[PDB]
Design an enzyme around this catalytic site. Structure first.
Site, PDB file in Angstrom:
ATOM      1  N   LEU A  50       0.797  -1.218   0.000  1.00 31.92           N
ATOM      2  CA  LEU A  50       0.000   0.000   0.000  1.00 31.92           C
ATOM      3  C   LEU A  50       0.833   1.273   0.000  1.00 31.92           C
ATOM      4  CD1 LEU A  50      -3.199  -0.420   2.179  1.00 31.92           C
ATOM      5  CD2 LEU A  50      -2.878  -0.498  -0.303  1.00 31.92           C
ATOM      6  N   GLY A  51       2.069   1.217   0.470  1.00 38.08           N
ATOM      7  CA  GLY A  51       2.914   2.393   0.498  1.00 38.08           C
ATOM      8  C   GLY A  51       4.028   2.237   1.504  1.00 38.08           C
ATOM      9  N   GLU A  52       4.993   3.149   1.409  1.00 39.69           N
ATOM     10  CA  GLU A  52       6.163   3.121   2.275  1.00 39.69           C
ATOM     11  C   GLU A  52       6.600   4.541   2.595  1.00 39.69           C
ATOM     12  OE1 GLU A  52       9.489   1.026   0.686  1.00 39.69           O
ATOM     13  OE2 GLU A  52      10.959   2.015   1.985  1.00 39.69           O
ATOM     14  N   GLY A  53       6.712   4.843   3.885  1.00 38.35           N
ATOM     15  CA  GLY A  53       7.240   6.116   4.328  1.00 38.35           C
ATOM     16  C   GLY A  53       8.524   5.941   5.112  1.00 38.35           C
ATOM     17  N   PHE A  67       8.724   5.975   8.344  1.00 39.39           N
ATOM     18  CA  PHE A  67       8.448   5.201   9.549  1.00 39.39           C
ATOM     19  C   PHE A  67       8.454   3.708   9.256  1.00 39.39           C
ATOM     20  CE2 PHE A  67       6.476   9.325  10.573  1.00 39.39           C
ATOM     21  CZ  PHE A  67       7.075   9.573  11.793  1.00 39.39           C
ATOM     22  N   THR A  79       6.236   0.464   6.487  1.00 38.26           N
ATOM     23  CA  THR A  79       5.567   0.133   5.239  1.00 38.26           C
ATOM     24  C   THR A  79       4.185  -0.429   5.542  1.00 38.26           C
ATOM     25  OG1 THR A  79       6.522  -2.093   5.170  1.00 38.26           O
ATOM     26  CG2 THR A  79       7.770  -0.324   4.130  1.00 38.26           C
ATOM     27  N   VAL A  80       3.229  -0.140   4.664  1.00 40.16           N
ATOM     28  CA  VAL A  80       1.830  -0.497   4.867  1.00 40.16           C
ATOM     29  C   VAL A  80       1.401  -1.466   3.775  1.00 40.16           C
ATOM     30  CG1 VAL A  80      -0.501   0.374   5.232  1.00 40.16           C
ATOM     31  CG2 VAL A  80       1.467   1.783   5.855  1.00 40.16           C
ATOM     32  N   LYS A  84       0.749  -2.053   9.180  1.00 36.97           N
ATOM     33  CA  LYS A  84       1.898  -1.161   9.128  1.00 36.97           C
ATOM     34  C   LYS A  84       3.072  -1.847   9.814  1.00 36.97           C
ATOM     35  CE  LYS A  84       0.965   2.910  10.361  1.00 36.97           C
ATOM     36  NZ  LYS A  84       0.702   4.188  11.078  1.00 36.97           N
ATOM     37  N   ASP A 144      -0.809  15.889  14.308  1.00 38.04           N
ATOM     38  CA  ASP A 144      -0.378  15.634  12.941  1.00 38.04           C
ATOM     39  C   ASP A 144      -1.562  15.701  11.996  1.00 38.04           C
ATOM     40  OD1 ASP A 144       2.218  15.365  11.853  1.00 38.04           O
ATOM     41  OD2 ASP A 144       1.721  13.352  11.130  1.00 38.04           O
TER      42      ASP A 144
HETATM   43  C1  LIG Z   1      -4.494   3.130   9.388  1.00 39.27           C
HETATM   44  C2  LIG Z   1      -3.450   3.095   8.268  1.00 39.27           C
HETATM   45  C3  LIG Z   1      -2.338   2.080   8.564  1.00 39.27           C
HETATM   46  C4  LIG Z   1      -4.142   2.766   6.868  1.00 39.27           C
HETATM   47  C5  LIG Z   1      -5.391   2.157   6.669  1.00 39.27           C
HETATM   48  N1  LIG Z   1      -5.593   2.065   5.313  1.00 39.27           N
HETATM   49  N2  LIG Z   1      -4.461   2.615   4.672  1.00 39.27           N
HETATM   50  C6  LIG Z   1      -4.184   2.750   3.351  1.00 39.27           C
HETATM   51  N3  LIG Z   1      -5.171   2.283   2.335  1.00 39.27           N
HETATM   52  C7  LIG Z   1      -5.199   2.796   0.915  1.00 39.27           C
HETATM   53  C8  LIG Z   1      -5.095   4.348   0.760  1.00 39.27           C
HETATM   54  C9  LIG Z   1      -4.696   4.872  -0.456  1.00 39.27           C
HETATM   55  C10 LIG Z   1      -4.592   6.250  -0.630  1.00 39.27           C
HETATM   56  C11 LIG Z   1      -4.890   7.111   0.421  1.00 39.27           C
HETATM   57  C12 LIG Z   1      -5.288   6.596   1.642  1.00 39.27           C
HETATM   58  C13 LIG Z   1      -5.400   5.218   1.811  1.00 39.27           C
HETATM   59  C14 LIG Z   1      -2.997   3.322   2.967  1.00 39.27           C
HETATM   60  C15 LIG Z   1      -2.092   3.766   3.923  1.00 39.27           C
HETATM   61  N4  LIG Z   1      -0.827   4.381   3.555  1.00 39.27           N
HETATM   62  C16 LIG Z   1      -0.344   4.709   2.197  1.00 39.27           C
HETATM   63  C17 LIG Z   1      -1.249   5.612   1.296  1.00 39.27           C
HETATM   64  N5  LIG Z   1      -0.749   6.998   1.359  1.00 39.27           N
HETATM   65  C18 LIG Z   1       0.719   6.886   1.505  1.00 39.27           C
HETATM   66  C19 LIG Z   1       1.015   5.514   2.200  1.00 39.27           C
HETATM   67  O1  LIG Z   1       1.420   5.759   3.519  1.00 39.27           O
HETATM   68  N6  LIG Z   1      -2.382   3.622   5.209  1.00 39.27           N
HETATM   69  C20 LIG Z   1      -3.587   3.036   5.596  1.00 39.27           C
END
Ligand SMILES: CC(C)c1cnn2c(NCc3ccccc3)cc(N[C@H]3CNC[C@H]3O)nc12
Lengths: 65, 279, 286
Positions: C9-12, C14, C16-17, C26, C113
């Protein structure tokens, strides 16, 4: 479909805590440390600390496990 | 807030009998696992309780001499962690000496008392090699401790409720003209309450109020009017009786508490080192 | 464990998700302090507009946090030119944010934040505050604090002036910035530095005086700027009603104490005026 404010009703299982804006009126704030101008400028008041202390004092006093 | 906290929901138990049941179940489960794996070596639950009391006192002493000065909230959180861990775990499976240090480490992390690992382990009266070994053990057991706490890290201590009760007494109970002189004694009783099982059996507000009223009774001051009038319990007679019996039960727990005896502590300590070496 | 990983889903910086089975996971110091902060705070909170920590699991000094999977966030909504942010949509987003914030604040926790990418939306249009890695409990005079919180674009003037102690005003100012971004579809005060952020704030809103902010000069990093008149609020947001302008003005008061709280903002006539907030099922999706 309009929104009407309803206060958050969470049971505290304890005595009623006076409202945040009434503490100074009720004499509580004369028993807590006065906030500094630095802390006041950032939005911190002694009312917050007093309210938190009173809520924790009264939280769950009547509750039994 | 405590009234919807994990401490109230999952870690406040109905009776001391339930606590003894949990500890005996832990002891029995460890014995069963050791037997299945492949004797006078095993400790009894009362011996485990004696060792847990001794090592909780050790944790108190560690947190007291900690530098930089450790906030009392962190100490309370760590001691509650120790109690909760050894509610469901045997000292013969995880050594209390390592577990108490891990409790202090996790508590410092959780209560945002920012301290680095080297200066955390520098507080130990150990050689640098021993300090590094202890740090490795703490890092190994940190996740284990968190898992055994069921990821419930926020601990509600009685200190802030005590301060709030003092504020309320100063504001609304003029009969007790100076509540401040009730502090040092009410603190002392508070600490004694910490040594018993009360933190697992009563709310922090109840503990703080019981300490305050025990200090008042020790001062010859009868402030039942504070309960009936100021806290509006004259409306709910049953609630007032329930609160008074809670306080009486807390005082009974404090009066019957037995500090661990040094000779028994040494014997059980040799026994525990034997258990850990044999395993 | 019991979770099978479906998507990355993504990586920052901190962690990776991953979207796993639906939940989102996460991934010498020991267990990461940010993860511990999230765990400890989210285990003590339960509200439909706050992200819920379902479970945590890890190995050694590593850890993985399980949350509900959230479809999108407010940043993607704002940056999507193919959807129109009607007043009802803005009101709905604002209402969910403020309800979550009211619950958070009454339990004495600041998000610290708040930004469109930290406001997640589920498949049902329910907004939840997320990323509690910077969240902290407030109301303790003994407690130490750091002024370098909140992303710069959404940081409050008291934070930009180095206020150590602060209350819900930081979240409320971030909320005002988020509302302004919702209205303008672009960041409100996109400064490239702390000084540039303060300068843009005082250009758009005016340089505060001793009357609008009594002890402002007492903050440590306070630097006096020129007497910028400030653009009137009805010129910045030309399609905003008087109730919305009142809400914005309350959210953007330079005095953090006078700045409206979440409860007061919820009580504002703007939220009770017609039209009502959009139902979550009908909120726009990218
Ligand atoms: C609670 C938290 C751990 C969580 C729950 N769902 N989710 C998603 N789902 C998909 C999405 C796609 C786009 C925008 C928001 C969401 C992504 C994400 N992180 C990604 C997306 N934006 C940069 C990265 O950090 N974190 C989470």
């Amino acid at each position: 479909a309009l929104y009407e404010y309803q206060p958050l009703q969470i049971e505290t299982y304890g005595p009623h805590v006076p409202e945040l804006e009434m503490l100074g009126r009720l004499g509580y704030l004369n028993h807590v440390r006065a906030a500094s101008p630095q802390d006041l400028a950032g939005g911190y008041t002694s009312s917050l600390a007093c309210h938190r202390a009173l809520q924790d004092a009264f939280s769950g006093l009547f509750w039994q496990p | 807030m405590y009234h919807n906290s994990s401490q109230k929901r999952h870690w406040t138990f109905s009776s001391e009998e339930q606590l003894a049941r949990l500890r005996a179940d832990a002891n029995r489960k460890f014995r069963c696992k050791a037997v299945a794996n492949g004797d006078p070596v095993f400790l009894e639950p009362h011996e485990e309780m004696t060792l847990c009391k001794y090592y909780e006192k050790r944790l108190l002493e560690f947190c007291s001499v900690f530098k930089p000065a450790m906030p009392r909230s962190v100490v309370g959180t760590a001691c509650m962690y120790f109690k909760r861990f050894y509610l469901n775990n045997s000292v013969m499976e995880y050594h209390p000496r390592i577990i108490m240090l891990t409790c202090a480490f996790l508590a410092c992390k959780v209560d945002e008392f920012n301290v680095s690992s080297p200066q955390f382990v520098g507080n130990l009266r150990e050689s640098p090699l021993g300090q590094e070994k202890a740090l490795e053990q703490i890092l190994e057991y940190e996740l284990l401790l968190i898992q055994q706490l069921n990821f419930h890290l926020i601990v509600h201590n009685p200190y802030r409720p005590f301060e709030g009760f003092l504020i309320d007494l100063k504001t609304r109970y003029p009969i007790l003209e100076n509540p401040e002189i009730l502090r040092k004694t009410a603190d002392d009783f508070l600490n004694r309450i910490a040594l018993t099982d009360a933190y697992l059996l009563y709310t922090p507000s109840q503990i703080a109020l019981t300490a305050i009223l025990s200090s008042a009774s020790r001062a010859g001051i009868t402030m039942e009017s504070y309960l009936s009038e100021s806290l509006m319990l004259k409306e709910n007679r049953t609630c007032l009786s329930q609160l008074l019996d809670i306080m009486k039960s807390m005082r009974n727990l404090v009066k019957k508490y037995e500090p661990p005896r040094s000779e028994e502590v040494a014997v059980l300590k040799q026994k525990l080192e034997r258990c850990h070496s044999a395993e | 464990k019991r979770y099978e990983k479906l998507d990355f889903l993504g990586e920052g910086q901190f962690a990776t998700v991953y979207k796993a089975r639906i939940v989102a996971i996460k991934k010498k110091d020991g267990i990461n302090r940010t993860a511990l902060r999230e765990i400890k705070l989210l285990q003590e909170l339960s509200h439909p507009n706050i992200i819920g920590l379902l479970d945590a699991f890890g190995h050694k000094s590593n850890i993985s946090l399980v949350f509900d999977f959230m479809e999108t966030d407010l940043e993607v909504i704002i940056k999507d030119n193919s959807l129109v942010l009607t007043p009802s949509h803005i009101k709905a987003y604002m209402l969910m944010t403020l309800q979550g914030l009211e619950y958070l604040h009454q339990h004495w926790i600041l998000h610290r934040d708040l930004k469109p990418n930290n406001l997640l939306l589920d498949e049902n249009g329910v907004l939840k505050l997320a990323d509690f890695g910077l969240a902290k409990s407030f109301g303790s005079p003994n407690r130490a604090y750091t002024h370098q919180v909140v992303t710069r674009w959404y940081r409050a003037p008291e934070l930009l002036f180095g206020a150590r102690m602060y209350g819900v005003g930081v979240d409320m100012w971030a909320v005002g910035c988020i509302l302004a971004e919702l209205l303008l579809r672009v960041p409100f005060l996109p400064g490239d530095s702390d000084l540039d952020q303060l300068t843009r704030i005082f250009e758009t809103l005016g340089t505060p005086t001793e009357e609008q902010w009594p002890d402002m000069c007492s903050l440590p990093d306070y630097v006096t700027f020129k007497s910028f008149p400030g653009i009137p609020l009805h010129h910045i947001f030309s399609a905003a009603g008087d109730d919305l302008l009142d809400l914005i003005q309350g959210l953007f008061l330079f005095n953090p104490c006078a700045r409206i709280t979440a409860t007061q903002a919820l009580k504002m006539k703007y939220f009770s005026n017609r039209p009502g907030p959009t139902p979550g099922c009908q909120l726009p999706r990218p």
